[PDB]
Amino acid sequence: SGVEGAAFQSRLPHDRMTSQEAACFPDIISGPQQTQKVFLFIRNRTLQLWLDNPKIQLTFEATLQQLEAPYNSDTVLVHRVHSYLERHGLINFGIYKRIKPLPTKKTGKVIIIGSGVSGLAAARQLQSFGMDVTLLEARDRVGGRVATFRKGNYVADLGAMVVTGLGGNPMAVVSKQVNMELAKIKQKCPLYEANGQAVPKEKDEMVEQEFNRLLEATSYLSHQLDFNVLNNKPVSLGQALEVVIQLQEKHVKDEQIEHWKKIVKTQEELKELLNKMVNLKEKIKELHQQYKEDITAEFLVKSKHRDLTALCKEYDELAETQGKLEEKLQELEANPPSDVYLSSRDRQILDWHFANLEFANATPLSTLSLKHWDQDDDFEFTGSHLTVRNGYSCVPVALAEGLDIKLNTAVRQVRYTASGCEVIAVNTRSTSQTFIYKCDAVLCTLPLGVLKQQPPAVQFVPPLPEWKTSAVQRMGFGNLNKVVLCFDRVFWDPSVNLFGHVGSTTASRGELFLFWNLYKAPILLALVAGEAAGIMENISDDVIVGRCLAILKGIFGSSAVPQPKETVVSRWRADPWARGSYSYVAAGSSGNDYDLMAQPITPPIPRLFFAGEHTIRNYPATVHGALLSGLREAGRIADQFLG
Numbered sequence: 001s002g003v004e005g006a007a008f009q010s011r012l013p014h015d016r017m018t019s020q021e022a023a024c025f026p027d028i029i030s031g032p033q034q035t036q037k038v039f040l041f042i043r044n045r046t047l048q049l050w051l052d053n054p055k056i057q058l059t060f061e062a063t064l065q066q067l068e069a070p071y072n073s074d075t076v077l078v079h080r081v082h083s084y085l086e087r088h089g090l091i092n093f094g095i096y097k098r099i100k101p102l103p104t105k106k107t108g109k110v111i112i113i114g115s116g117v118s119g120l121a122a123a124r125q126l127q128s129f130g131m132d133v134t135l136l137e138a139r140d141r142v143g144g145r146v147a148t149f150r151k152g153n154y155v156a157d158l159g160a161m162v163v164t165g166l167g168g169n170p171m172a173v174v175s176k177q178v179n180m181e182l183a184k185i186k187q188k189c190p191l192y193e194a195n196g197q198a199v200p201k202e203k204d205e206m207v208e209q210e211f212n213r214l215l216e217a218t219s220y221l222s223h224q225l226d227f228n229v230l231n232n233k234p235v236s237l238g239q240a241l242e243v244v245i246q247l248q249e250k251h252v253k254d255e256q257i258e259h260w261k262k263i264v265k266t267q268e269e270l271k272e273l274l275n276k277m278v279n280l281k282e283k284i285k286e287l288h289q290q291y292k293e294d295i296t297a298e299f300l301v302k303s304k305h306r307d308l309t310a311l312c313k314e315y316d317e318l319a320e321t322q323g324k325l326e327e328k329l330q331e332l333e334a335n336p337p338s339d340v341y342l343s344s345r346d347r348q349i350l351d352w353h354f355a356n357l358e359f360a361n362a363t364p365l366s367t368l369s370l371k372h373w374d375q376d377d378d379f380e381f382t383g384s385h386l387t388v389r390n391g392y393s394c395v396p397v398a399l400a401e402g403l404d405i406k407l408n409t410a411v412r413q414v415r416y417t418a419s420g421c422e423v424i425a426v427n428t429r430s431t432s433q434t435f436i437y438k439c440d441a442v443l444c445t446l447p448l449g450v451l452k453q454q455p456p457a458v459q460f461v462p463p464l465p466e467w468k469t470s471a472v473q474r475m476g477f478g479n480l481n482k483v484v485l486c487f488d489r490v491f492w493d494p495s496v497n498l499f500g501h502v503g504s505t506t507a508s509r510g511e512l513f514l515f516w517n518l519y520k521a522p523i524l525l526a527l528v529a530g531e532a533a534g535i536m537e538n539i540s541d542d543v544i545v546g547r548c549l550a551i552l553k554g555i556f557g558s559s560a561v562p563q564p565k566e567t568v569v570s571r572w573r574a575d576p577w578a579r580g581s582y583s584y585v586a587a588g589s590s591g592n593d594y595d596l597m598a599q600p601i602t603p604p605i606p607r608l609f610f611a612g613e614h615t616i617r618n619y620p621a622t623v624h625g626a627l628l629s630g631l632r633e634a635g636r637i638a639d640q641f642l643g
């Protein structure tokens with residue numbers, strides 16, 4: 001299944017047309033189904049040709065010459081399919097050698113705001129389409145939220161660092177194009193408690209099992225019993241989790257109650273039984289006395305005998321139905337149900353798993369939409385997640401090649417009229433001098449964090465619509481930070497990619513809870529997630545680093561941990577060019593807000609466009625999502641201005 005694989009790698013069903021293809025090829029969709037079969041084959045085959053060699057441009061001509069008969073005879077259809085694929089960035093995207101050098105005459109002018117992955121991806125596309133494009137970037141470097149620290153042989157990512165599975169991932173293509181080294185993340189992640197001692201394999205698995213069950217329960221509660229609203233307020237994942245925990249505690253307490261009652265019932269039956277036995281002893285004494293007096297005794301002794309014995313066919317008979325209780329009793333007082341749902345130490349380990357979830361969503365669980373937080377799960381790529389051994393920055397740096405990028409240029413105003421656009425920016429090195437760039441269209445890749453800024457960092461004239469600002473307000477924008485510790489010696493286990501630090505309290509569960517071992521040099525990356533992320537930004541590097549070494553010394557022993565030669569600490573929330581790490585579906589929002597974020601603003605025809613991780617519903621908060629949003633917008637714009 002080569003062509004079938006190509007469709008999959010392109011996130012398309014290999015045996016049916018998509019709604020997009022239906023719209024652009026209505027004559028094929030509403031026509032002979034045999035022609036559709038031909039369409040899909042041409043499409044899947046063209047993708048395969050591109051994917052088999054993503055370093056060279058795939059021309060219409062080369063596609064035609066490589067298609068087998070009878071396909072290579074339907075010249076017009078092939079061109080229609082090749083043009084569509086190229087326009088929408090499914091082929092000839094990223095970085096590749098052009099065999100068809102760009103035309104000197106550039107049509108249309110578009111200003112891209114932001115030189116991150118989405119802006120860069122869109123820039124390259126628009127340029128290859130022959131448009132005049134200039135990127136305005138506030139920072140003194142490209143990449144935005146993909147940021148790599150490089151000094152000597154030290155390499156460490158302060159922004160994105162993980163690639164999520166290559167099957168269907170556009171980054172699989174870009175990876176090949178820029179020669180970026182990826183390493184699969186080894187699963188083993190040992191956990192250490194606050195005292196530094198390792199958590200036994202048993203408990204680790206037990207608690208992780210509960211975590212999974214707890215999450216599965218919130219999903220049931222949400223997508224079955226429709227428990228998504230309470231007191232007119234939307235329910236958060238954090239909220240639901242604490243409720244499911246309470247129920248577990250209730251159940252445990254109920255089984256404890258029932259058990260104690262079995263004990264008390266058995267204890268009462270015994271006491272009462274012992275009491276009638278004591279009276280039967282007193283009744284037997286009444287006989288082992290009296291019984292022995294006269295001459296008719298040959299009949300009086302017989303009588304007193306078959307009488308005193310019958311009272312033993314009664315007594316030791318009770319001692320029998322007594323041993324069946326002392327047995328039942330001791331059996332119960334030896335097999336008590338769980339005393340608690342989670343021991344104090346168990347709850348701390350569970351909180352480590354919640355912190356891990358707060359890391360992934362870049363936000364405290366109490367802010368996540370119970371119903372939509374995993375809204376995009378159905379789009380995950382297949383395969384092991386990987387890490388970028390040589391620094392993720394190699395991607396935006398390569399994507400910037402040949403582009404007209406203006407660094408240290410912060411945009412402050414965006415004007416858009418029915419007949420043109422004006423973008424006003426200022427030199428960040430001398431806020432005195434401003435710049436005024438005229439253009440036909442503006443592509444805004446500003447982070448959701450900057451769009452939410454109050455007072456606004458950049459002004460829109462006219463101001464953005466209410467349906468856009470409302471969506472910007474509902475959507476969540478998280479935070480996550482890292483501390484880079486550069487040593488001259490490796491004191492950790494080189495075979496382990498990650499290990500966790502279990503915090504003491506629920507509130508600080510995200511503080512330096514996870515350490516990563518990913519590079520050539522002796523470097524460790526520690527994460528600060530959830531509530532701890534924003535708070536820790538208020539601590540100086542020295543103090544935060546010291547707390548790290550304290551954790552590390554507790555695990556590997558002091559004297560084993562030398563002072564770091566180099567350290568880097570990120571503060572994404574305080575970073576004015578980001579104001580956070582990435583978006584998350586907030587309680588009260590939904591995946592639709594991502595679609596609303598993608599919508600262009602048009603007074604008589606589309607003028608203001610949007611790209612970025614926050615504008616792509618099926619791939620939010622990721623580098624590939626940023627990439628795809630950029631490819632998407634370049635297509636929408638070329639369609640408007642080039643036809």
Ligand SMILES: Cc1cc2c(cc1C)N(C(=O)CCc1ccccc1)c1c([nH]c(=O)[nH]c1=O)N2C[C@H](O)[C@H](O)[C@H](O)COP(=O)(O)OP(=O)(O)OC[C@H]1O[C@@H](n2cnc3c(N)ncnc32)[C@H](O)[C@@H]1O
Nearest residue numbers: 114116118138144145159160161162411612613622623626
């Ligand atoms: C901050 C951050 C972000 C990410 C991560 C860690 C951290 C600390 N990584 C993770 O820990 C996540 C892992 C993860 C695994 C699986 C799924 C999801 C996540 C991570 C991860 N994503 C991922 O796939 N794998 C990852 O490993 N992210 C998120 C991505 O970095 C992010 O979604 C993506 O880079 C967004 O790119 P965009 O182009 O949408 O935004 P940005 O790069 O910020 O570009 C905007 C530009 O605008 C510029 N700018 C601003 N204001 C102005 C102005 N006024 N004028 C002119 N220019 C301006 C600003 O400086 C930027 O250069």
